[PDB]
Design a protein around this ligand. Structure first.
Ligand SMILES: CC(C)NC(=O)Cn1cc(CN2CCN(C)CC2)c2ccc(NC(=S)NCCc3c[nH]c4ccccc34)cc21
Ligand SMILES: CC(C)NC(=O)Cn1cc(CN2CCN(C)CC2)c2ccc(NC(=S)NCCc3c[nH]c4ccccc34)cc21
Lengths: 123, 123
């Protein structure tokens, strides 16, 4: 409310969280997408994705160390979205727009889908 | 670099991380401060504190579920800093500044220490 605001703190936290991912420090889940595998932190996955929230919030699945995604998910599209989660930067190109949008819908990241919609429209 | 920037994503992630802490979801450590206990996420602690980074980055201590802080640490001051880590907001009042500053020194949060110094200077 009337507390002092650190305007860079949130971005600095996310940057260190991504650094921890890049060194595999306290990563607690691998996400299998067809042939690929991505290690990550369940907390960040839950904070950023409705699908991952709905999985790990259920005590039936909260302790899983492996999550197999839908085999139709494109790994490049997932990687772009995983990067976004940890960076706030979304790499939308003409060559990946369709794969990134579809993957964002499957992961229930509405703002990204909403931004994919505006990207479409601005093309 | 040339990707789309989501200016509110990092703050949105931290808010959900704090929500997860408030429901004790995926918390993986308890910090003992005199007669008090605080549950938290090791990744957030490490991202925010040089002390907590140095502890959990060491494989000798990375798997600890309990951390006992120095008995001289004031629990209210620790709580204020724990809140700051998860909110980017620092509750500095001249009734608590000394105990917050000394705690931020122990936790190796230089940004906060530097701010406490200017709070003193701005009187
Ligand atoms: C970084 C940020 C912008 N990314 C998201 O918000 C992605 N996301 C997208 C959704 C799904 N949306 C939600 C809004 N709704 C109208 C349409 C469907 C979603 C859901 C959960 C989380 N993760 C966490 S920790 N949420 C804590 C609050 C909460 C949400 N639903 C709850 C259910 C029970 C208790 C708490 C909650 C992230 C989610
Ligand atoms: C959210 C942000 C504003 N809060 C901090 O930065 C609090 N903090 C304060 C310090 C201690 N400072 C650091 C600067 N130095 C000149 C004086 C002492 C500190 C240390 C680690 C972390 N956590 C993480 S993940 N760091 C990843 C990068 C890294 C730092 N040291 C490394 C050593 C080896 C490998 C990597 C690194 C947080 C730290």
């Amino acid at each position: 409310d009337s507390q002092i605001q650190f305007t860079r703190h949130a971005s600095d936290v996310l940057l260190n969280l991504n650094r921890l991912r890049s060194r595999d420090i306290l990563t607690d889940v691998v996400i299998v997408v067809s042939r690929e595998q991505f290690r990550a932190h369940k907390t960040v996955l839950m904070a950023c994705s409705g699908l991952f929230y709905s999985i790990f919030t259920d005590q039936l699945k909260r302790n899983l160390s492996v999550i197999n995604l839908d085999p139709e998910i494109n790994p490049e599209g997932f990687n772009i979205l995983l990067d976004f989660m940890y960076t706030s930067r979304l790499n939308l190109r003409v060559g990946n727009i369709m794969a990134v949008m579809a993957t964002a819908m499957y992961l229930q990241m509405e703002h990204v889908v909403d931004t994919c919609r505006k990207f479409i429209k601005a093309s």
